Write a protein that binds this ligand. Structure first.
Ligand SMILES: CCCCCCCCCCCCCCCC(=O)O
Length: 136
């Protein structure tokens, strides 16, 4: 009912820069055609909070996806590249930390506020991709 910690994430955000995303997708195991088309996308990310439930939507020409979750509570996620993963998202000192597990593999996506930006760091096996979003 009062202000939530994650309120700083709430809003509509647009992708403005990406680094190393193709390499990150390769490490995750994303196939050629999906990497090419997904790498071209300039998504909007819409984040909202309602009680304990955080919703993150990604809208792009490639795919529209949405996840809703409670911090610390594992859920099923079908990713944009059609991985069926088990996901858990927590808040660690202001940073949303999203761990995806599938097929004995794991990747971590961190989302944080930096100045007026929302910075998304995707990490797989030593490869990091940084994606920067600004308010739409
Ligand atoms: C981010 C949506 C468009 C690109 C879809 C990428 C599909 C393959 C990789 C899935 C990992 C998703 C990484 C999230 C990064 C982000 O939201 O910008």
């Amino acid at each position: 009912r009062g202000s939530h910690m994650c309120d700083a994430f709430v809003g509509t955000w647009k992708l403005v820069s990406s680094e190393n995303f193709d390499d990150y997708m390769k490490e995750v195991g994303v196939g050629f055609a999906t990497r090419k088309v997904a790498g071209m996308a300039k998504p909007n990310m819409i984040i909202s909070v309602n009680g304990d439930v955080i919703t993150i939507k990604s809208e792009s020409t490639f795919k529209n996806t949405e996840i809703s979750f409670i911090l610390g509570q594992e859920f099923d996620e079908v990713t944009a590249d059609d991985r069926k993963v088990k996901s858990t998202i927590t808040l660690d000192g202001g940073v949303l930390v999203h761990v995806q597990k599938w097929d004995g593999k794991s990747t971590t996506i961190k989302r944080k506020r930096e100045d007026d930006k929302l910075v998304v760091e995707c990490v797989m096996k030593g490869v990091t991709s940084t994606r920067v979003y600004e308010r739409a």
